[PDB]
mmCIF file of N, CA and C in Angstrom:
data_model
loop_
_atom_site.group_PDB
_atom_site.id
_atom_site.type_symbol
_atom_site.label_atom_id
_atom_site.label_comp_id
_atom_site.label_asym_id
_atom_site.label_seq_id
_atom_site.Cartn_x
_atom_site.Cartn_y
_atom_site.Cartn_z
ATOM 1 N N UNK A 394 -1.149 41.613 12.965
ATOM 2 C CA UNK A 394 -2.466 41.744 12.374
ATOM 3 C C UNK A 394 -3.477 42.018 13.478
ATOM 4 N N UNK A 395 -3.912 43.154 12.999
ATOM 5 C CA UNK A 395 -5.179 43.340 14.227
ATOM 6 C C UNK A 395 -6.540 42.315 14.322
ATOM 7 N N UNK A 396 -6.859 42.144 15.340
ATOM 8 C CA UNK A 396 -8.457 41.358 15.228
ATOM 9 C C UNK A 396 -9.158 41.920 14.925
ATOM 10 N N UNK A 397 -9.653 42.558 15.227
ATOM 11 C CA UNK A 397 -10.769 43.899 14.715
ATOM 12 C C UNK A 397 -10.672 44.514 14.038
ATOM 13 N N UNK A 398 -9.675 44.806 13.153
ATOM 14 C CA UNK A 398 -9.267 45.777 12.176
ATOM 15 C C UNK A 398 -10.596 45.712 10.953
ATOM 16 N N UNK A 399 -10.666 44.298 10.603
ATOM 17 C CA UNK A 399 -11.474 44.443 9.271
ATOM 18 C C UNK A 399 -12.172 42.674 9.339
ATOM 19 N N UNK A 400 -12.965 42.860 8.435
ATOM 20 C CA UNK A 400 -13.962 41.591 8.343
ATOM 21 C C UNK A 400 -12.716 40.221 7.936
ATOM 22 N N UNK A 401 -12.091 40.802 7.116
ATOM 23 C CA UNK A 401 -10.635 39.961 6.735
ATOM 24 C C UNK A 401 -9.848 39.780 7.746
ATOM 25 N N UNK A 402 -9.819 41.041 8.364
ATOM 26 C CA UNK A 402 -8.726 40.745 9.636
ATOM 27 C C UNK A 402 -9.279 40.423 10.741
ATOM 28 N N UNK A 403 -10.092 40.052 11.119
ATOM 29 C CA UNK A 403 -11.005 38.999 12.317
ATOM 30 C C UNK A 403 -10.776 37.972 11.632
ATOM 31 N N UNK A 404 -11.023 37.482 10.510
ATOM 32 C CA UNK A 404 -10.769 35.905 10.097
ATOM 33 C C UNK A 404 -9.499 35.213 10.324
ATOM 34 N N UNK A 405 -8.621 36.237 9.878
ATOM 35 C CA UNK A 405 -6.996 35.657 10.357
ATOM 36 C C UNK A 405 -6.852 35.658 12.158
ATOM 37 N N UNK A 406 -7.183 36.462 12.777
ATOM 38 C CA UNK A 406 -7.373 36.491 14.099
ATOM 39 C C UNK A 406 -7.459 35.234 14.616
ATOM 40 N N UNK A 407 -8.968 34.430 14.136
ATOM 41 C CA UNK A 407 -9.174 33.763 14.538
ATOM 42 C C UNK A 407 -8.530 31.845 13.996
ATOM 43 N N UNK A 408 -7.902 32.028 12.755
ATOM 44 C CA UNK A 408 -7.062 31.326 11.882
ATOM 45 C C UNK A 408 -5.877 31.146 12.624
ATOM 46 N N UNK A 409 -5.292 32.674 13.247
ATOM 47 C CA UNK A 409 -4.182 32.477 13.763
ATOM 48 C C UNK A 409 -3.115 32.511 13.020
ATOM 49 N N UNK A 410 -3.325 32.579 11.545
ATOM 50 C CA UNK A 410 -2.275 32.689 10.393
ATOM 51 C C UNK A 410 -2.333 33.639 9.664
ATOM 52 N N UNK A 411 -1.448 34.248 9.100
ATOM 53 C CA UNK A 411 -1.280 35.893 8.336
ATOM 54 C C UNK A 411 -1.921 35.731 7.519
ATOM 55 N N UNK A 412 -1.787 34.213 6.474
ATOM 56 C CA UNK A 412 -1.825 33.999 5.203
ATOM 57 C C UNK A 412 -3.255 33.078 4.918
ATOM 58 N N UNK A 413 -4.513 33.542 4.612
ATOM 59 C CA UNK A 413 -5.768 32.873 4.809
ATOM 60 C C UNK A 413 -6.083 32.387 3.153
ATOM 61 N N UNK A 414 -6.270 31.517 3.119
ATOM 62 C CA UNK A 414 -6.660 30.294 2.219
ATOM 63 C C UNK A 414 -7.814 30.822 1.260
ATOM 64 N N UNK A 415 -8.168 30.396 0.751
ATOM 65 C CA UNK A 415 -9.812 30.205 0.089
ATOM 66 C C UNK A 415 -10.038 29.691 0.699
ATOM 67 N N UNK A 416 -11.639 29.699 0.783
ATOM 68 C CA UNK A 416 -12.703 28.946 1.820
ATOM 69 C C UNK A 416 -13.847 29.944 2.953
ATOM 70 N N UNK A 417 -14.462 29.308 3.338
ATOM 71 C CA UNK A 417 -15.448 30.240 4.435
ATOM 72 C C UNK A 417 -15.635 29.848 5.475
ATOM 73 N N UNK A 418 -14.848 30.781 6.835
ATOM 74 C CA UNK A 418 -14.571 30.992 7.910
ATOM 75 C C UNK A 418 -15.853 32.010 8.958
ATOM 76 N N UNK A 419 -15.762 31.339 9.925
ATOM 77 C CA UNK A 419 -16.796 31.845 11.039
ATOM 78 C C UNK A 419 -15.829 32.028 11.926
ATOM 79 N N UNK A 420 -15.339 33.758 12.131
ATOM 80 C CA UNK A 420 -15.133 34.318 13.337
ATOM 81 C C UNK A 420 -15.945 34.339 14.621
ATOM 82 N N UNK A 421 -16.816 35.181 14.510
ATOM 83 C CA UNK A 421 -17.947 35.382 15.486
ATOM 84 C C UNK A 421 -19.022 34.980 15.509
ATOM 85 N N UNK A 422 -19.315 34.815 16.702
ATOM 86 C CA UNK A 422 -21.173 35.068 16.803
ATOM 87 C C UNK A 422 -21.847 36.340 17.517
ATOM 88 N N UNK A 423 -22.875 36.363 16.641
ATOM 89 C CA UNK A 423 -23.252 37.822 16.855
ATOM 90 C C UNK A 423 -24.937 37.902 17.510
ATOM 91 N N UNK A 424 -25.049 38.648 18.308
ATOM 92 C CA UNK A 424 -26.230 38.745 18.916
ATOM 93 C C UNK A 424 -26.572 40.277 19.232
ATOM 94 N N UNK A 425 -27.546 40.709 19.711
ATOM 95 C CA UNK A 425 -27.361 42.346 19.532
ATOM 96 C C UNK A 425 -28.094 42.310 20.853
ATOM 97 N N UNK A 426 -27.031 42.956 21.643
ATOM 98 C CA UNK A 426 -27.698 43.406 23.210
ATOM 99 C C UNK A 426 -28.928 44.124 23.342
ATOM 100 N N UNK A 427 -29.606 44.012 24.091
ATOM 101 C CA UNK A 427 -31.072 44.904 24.420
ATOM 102 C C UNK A 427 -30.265 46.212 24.836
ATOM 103 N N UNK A 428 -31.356 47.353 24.069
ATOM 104 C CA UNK A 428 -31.025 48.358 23.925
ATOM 105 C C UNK A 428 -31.712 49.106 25.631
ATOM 106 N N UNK A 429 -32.860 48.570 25.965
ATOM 107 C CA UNK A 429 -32.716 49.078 27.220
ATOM 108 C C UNK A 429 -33.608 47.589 28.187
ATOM 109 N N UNK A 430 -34.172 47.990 29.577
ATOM 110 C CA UNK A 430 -34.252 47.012 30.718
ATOM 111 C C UNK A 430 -36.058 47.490 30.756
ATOM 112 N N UNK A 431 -36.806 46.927 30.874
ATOM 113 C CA UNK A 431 -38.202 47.195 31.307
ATOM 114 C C UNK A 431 -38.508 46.170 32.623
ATOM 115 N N UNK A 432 -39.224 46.981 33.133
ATOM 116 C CA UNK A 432 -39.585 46.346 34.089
ATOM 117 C C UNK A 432 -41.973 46.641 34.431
ATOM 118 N N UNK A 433 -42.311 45.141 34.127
ATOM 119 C CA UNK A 433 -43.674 45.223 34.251
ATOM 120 C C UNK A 433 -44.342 44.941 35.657
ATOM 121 N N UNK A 434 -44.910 45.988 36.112
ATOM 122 C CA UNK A 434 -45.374 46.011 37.645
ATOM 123 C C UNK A 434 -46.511 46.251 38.232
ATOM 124 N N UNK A 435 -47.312 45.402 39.735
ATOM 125 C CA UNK A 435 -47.883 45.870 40.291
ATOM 126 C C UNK A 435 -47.821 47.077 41.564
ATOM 127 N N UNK A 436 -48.473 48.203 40.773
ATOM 128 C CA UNK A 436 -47.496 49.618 41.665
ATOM 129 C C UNK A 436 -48.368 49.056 43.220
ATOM 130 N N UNK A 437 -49.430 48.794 43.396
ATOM 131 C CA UNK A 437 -49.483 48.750 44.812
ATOM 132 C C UNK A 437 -48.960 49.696 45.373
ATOM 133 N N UNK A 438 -47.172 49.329 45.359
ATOM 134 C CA UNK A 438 -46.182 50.042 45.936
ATOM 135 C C UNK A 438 -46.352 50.156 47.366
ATOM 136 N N UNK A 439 -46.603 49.251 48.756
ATOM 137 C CA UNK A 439 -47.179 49.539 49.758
ATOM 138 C C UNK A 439 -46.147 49.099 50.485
ATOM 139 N N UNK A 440 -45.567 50.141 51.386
ATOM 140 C CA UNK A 440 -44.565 49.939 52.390
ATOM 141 C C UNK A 440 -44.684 48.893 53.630
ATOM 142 N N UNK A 441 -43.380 48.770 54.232
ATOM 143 C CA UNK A 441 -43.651 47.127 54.853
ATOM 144 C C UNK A 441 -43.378 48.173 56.795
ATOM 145 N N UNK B 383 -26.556 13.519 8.669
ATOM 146 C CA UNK B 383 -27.677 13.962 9.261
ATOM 147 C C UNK B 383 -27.633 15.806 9.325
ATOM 148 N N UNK B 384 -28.393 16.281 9.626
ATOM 149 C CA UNK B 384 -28.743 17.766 10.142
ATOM 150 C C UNK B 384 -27.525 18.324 10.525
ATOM 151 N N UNK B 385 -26.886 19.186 9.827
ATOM 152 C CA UNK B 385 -25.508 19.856 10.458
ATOM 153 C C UNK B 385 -26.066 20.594 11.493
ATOM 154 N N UNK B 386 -25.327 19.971 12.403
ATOM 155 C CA UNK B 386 -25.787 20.995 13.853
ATOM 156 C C UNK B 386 -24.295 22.146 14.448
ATOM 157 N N UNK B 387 -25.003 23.366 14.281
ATOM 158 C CA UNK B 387 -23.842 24.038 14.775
ATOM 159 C C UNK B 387 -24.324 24.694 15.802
ATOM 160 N N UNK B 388 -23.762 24.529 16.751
ATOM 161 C CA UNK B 388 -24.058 25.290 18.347
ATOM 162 C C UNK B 388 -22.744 25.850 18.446
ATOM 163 N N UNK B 389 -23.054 27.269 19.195
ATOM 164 C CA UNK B 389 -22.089 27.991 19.860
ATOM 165 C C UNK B 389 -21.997 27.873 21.652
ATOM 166 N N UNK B 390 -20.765 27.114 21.370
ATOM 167 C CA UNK B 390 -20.286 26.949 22.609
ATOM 168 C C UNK B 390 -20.423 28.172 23.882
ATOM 169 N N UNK B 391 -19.968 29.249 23.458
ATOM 170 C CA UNK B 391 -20.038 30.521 24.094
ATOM 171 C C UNK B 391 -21.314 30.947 24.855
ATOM 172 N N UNK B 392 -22.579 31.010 24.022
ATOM 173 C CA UNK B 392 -23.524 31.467 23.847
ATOM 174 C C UNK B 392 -24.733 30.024 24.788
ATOM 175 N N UNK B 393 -24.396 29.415 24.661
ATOM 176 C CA UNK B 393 -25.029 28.020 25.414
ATOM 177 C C UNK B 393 -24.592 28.303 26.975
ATOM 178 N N UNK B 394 -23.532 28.336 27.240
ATOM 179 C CA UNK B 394 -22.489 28.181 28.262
ATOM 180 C C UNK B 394 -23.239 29.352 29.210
ATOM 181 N N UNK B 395 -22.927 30.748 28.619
ATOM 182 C CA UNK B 395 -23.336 31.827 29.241
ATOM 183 C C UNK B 395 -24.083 33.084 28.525
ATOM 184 N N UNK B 396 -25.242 33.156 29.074
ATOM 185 C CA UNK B 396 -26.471 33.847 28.313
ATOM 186 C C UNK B 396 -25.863 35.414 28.614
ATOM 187 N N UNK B 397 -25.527 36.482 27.955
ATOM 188 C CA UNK B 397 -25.227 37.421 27.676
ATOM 189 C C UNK B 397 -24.903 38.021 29.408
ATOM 190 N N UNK B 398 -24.073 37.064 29.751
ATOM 191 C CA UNK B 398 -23.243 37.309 31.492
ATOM 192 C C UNK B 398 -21.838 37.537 31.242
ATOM 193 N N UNK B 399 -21.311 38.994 31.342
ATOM 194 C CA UNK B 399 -19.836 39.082 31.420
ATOM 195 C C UNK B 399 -18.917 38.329 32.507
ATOM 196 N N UNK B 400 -20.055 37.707 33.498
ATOM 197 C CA UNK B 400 -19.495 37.015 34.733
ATOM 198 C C UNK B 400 -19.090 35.915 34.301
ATOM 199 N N UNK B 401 -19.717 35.265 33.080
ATOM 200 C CA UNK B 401 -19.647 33.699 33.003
ATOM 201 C C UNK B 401 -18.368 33.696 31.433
ATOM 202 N N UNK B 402 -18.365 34.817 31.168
ATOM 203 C CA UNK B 402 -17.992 34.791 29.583
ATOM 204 C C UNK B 402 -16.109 34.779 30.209
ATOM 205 N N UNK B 403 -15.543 35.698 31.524
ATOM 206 C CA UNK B 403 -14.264 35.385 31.866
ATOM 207 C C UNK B 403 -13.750 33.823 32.296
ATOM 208 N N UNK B 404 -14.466 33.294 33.072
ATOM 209 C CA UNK B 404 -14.772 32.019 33.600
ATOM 210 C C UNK B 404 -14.264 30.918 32.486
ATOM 211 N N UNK B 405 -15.000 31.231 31.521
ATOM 212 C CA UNK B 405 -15.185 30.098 30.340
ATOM 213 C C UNK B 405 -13.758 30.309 29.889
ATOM 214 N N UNK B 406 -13.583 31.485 29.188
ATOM 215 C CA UNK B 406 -11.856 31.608 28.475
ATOM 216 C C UNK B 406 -10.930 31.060 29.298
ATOM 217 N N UNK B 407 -10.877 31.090 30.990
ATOM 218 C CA UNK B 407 -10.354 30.216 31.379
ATOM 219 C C UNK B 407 -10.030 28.638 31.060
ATOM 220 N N UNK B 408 -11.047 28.113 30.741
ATOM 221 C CA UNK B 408 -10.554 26.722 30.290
ATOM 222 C C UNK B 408 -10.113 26.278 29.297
ATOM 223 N N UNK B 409 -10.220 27.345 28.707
ATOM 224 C CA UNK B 409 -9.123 26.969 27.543
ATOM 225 C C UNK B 409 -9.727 26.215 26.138
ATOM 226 N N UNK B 410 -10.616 26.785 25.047
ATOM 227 C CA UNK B 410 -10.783 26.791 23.961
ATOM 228 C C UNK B 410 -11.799 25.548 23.953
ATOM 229 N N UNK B 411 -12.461 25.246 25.136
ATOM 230 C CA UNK B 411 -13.227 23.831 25.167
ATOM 231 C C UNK B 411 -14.349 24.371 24.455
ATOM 232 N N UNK B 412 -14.677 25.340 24.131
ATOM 233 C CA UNK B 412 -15.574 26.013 23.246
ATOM 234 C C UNK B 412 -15.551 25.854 22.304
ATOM 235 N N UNK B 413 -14.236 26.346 21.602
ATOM 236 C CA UNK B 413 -13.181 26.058 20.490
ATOM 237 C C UNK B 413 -13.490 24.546 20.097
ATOM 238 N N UNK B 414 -12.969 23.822 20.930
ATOM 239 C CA UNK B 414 -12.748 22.124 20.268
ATOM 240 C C UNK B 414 -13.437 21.669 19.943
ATOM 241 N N UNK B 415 -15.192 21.776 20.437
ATOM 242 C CA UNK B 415 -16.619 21.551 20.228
ATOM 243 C C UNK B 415 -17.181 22.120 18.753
ATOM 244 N N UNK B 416 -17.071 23.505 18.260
ATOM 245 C CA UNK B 416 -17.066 24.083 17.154
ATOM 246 C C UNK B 416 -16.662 22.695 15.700
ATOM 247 N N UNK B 417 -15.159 22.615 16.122
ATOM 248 C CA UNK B 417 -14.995 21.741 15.126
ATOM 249 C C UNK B 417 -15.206 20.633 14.767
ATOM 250 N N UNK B 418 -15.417 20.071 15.771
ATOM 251 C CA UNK B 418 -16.145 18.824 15.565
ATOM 252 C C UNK B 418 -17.761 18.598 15.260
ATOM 253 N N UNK B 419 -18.559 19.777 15.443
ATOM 254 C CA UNK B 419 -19.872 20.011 15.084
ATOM 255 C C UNK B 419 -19.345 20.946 13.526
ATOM 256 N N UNK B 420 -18.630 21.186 13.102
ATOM 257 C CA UNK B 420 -18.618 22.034 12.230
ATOM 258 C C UNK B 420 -18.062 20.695 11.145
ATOM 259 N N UNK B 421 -17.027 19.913 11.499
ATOM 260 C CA UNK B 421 -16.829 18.786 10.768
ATOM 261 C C UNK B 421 -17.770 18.078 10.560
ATOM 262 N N UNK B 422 -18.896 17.576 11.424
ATOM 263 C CA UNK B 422 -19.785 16.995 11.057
ATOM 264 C C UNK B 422 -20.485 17.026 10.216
ATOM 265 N N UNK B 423 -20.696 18.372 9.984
ATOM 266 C CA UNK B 423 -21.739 19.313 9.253
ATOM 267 C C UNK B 423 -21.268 19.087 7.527
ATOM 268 N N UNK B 424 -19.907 19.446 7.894
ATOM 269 C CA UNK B 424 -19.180 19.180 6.245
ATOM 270 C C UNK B 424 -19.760 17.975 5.590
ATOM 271 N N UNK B 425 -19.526 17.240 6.734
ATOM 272 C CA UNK B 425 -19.327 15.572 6.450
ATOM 273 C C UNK B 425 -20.851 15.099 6.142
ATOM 274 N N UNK B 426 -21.913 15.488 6.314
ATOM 275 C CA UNK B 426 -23.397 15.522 6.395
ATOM 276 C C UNK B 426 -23.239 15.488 4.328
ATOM 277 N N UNK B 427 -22.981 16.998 4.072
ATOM 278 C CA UNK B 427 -22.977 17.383 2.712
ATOM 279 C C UNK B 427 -21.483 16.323 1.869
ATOM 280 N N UNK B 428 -20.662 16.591 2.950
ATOM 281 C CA UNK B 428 -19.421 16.070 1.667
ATOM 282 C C UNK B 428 -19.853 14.354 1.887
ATOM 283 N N UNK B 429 -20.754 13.578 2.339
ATOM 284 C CA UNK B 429 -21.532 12.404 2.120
ATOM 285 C C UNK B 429 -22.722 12.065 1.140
ATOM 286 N N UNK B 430 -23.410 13.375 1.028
ATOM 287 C CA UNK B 430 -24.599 13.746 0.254
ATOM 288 C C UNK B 430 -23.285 13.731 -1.154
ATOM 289 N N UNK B 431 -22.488 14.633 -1.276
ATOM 290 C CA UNK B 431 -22.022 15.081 -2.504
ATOM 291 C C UNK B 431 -21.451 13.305 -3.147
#
């Protein structure tokens, strides 16, 4: 059984068993990476 | 009381691929924490019920 295959097949993944029960299971946790990096500055910018 | 569910993972190491190999090393202590905050949680409601 793949882990990733399907929302069903992450649950057994993480069950560890082919054969999944009734009931409600938490595979993952999910967070959503920053899409990019900013950076807020004093340009000054004055060489040393 | 208040079902408290914390993710072990996510506490441990703030979105660091450095810290996230580290951790799987020890071996599911992430894991073991889950259920026992996740039992609690049951046990909060299946006390209420």
């Amino acid at each position: 059984v793949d882990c990733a295959l399907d929302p069903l097949s992450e649950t057994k993944c993480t069950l560890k068993s082919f054969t999944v029960e009734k009931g409600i299971y938490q595979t993952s946790n999910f967070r959503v990476q920053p899409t990019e990096s900013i950076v807020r500055f004093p340009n000054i910018t004055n060489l040393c | 009381m208040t079902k408290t569910s914390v993710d072990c993972t996510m506490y441990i190491c703030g979105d660091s691929t450095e810290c996230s190999n580290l951790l799987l090393q020890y071996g599911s202590f992430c894991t073991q924490l889950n259920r026992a905050l996740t039992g609690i949680a049951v046990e909060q409601d299946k006390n209420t019920q």
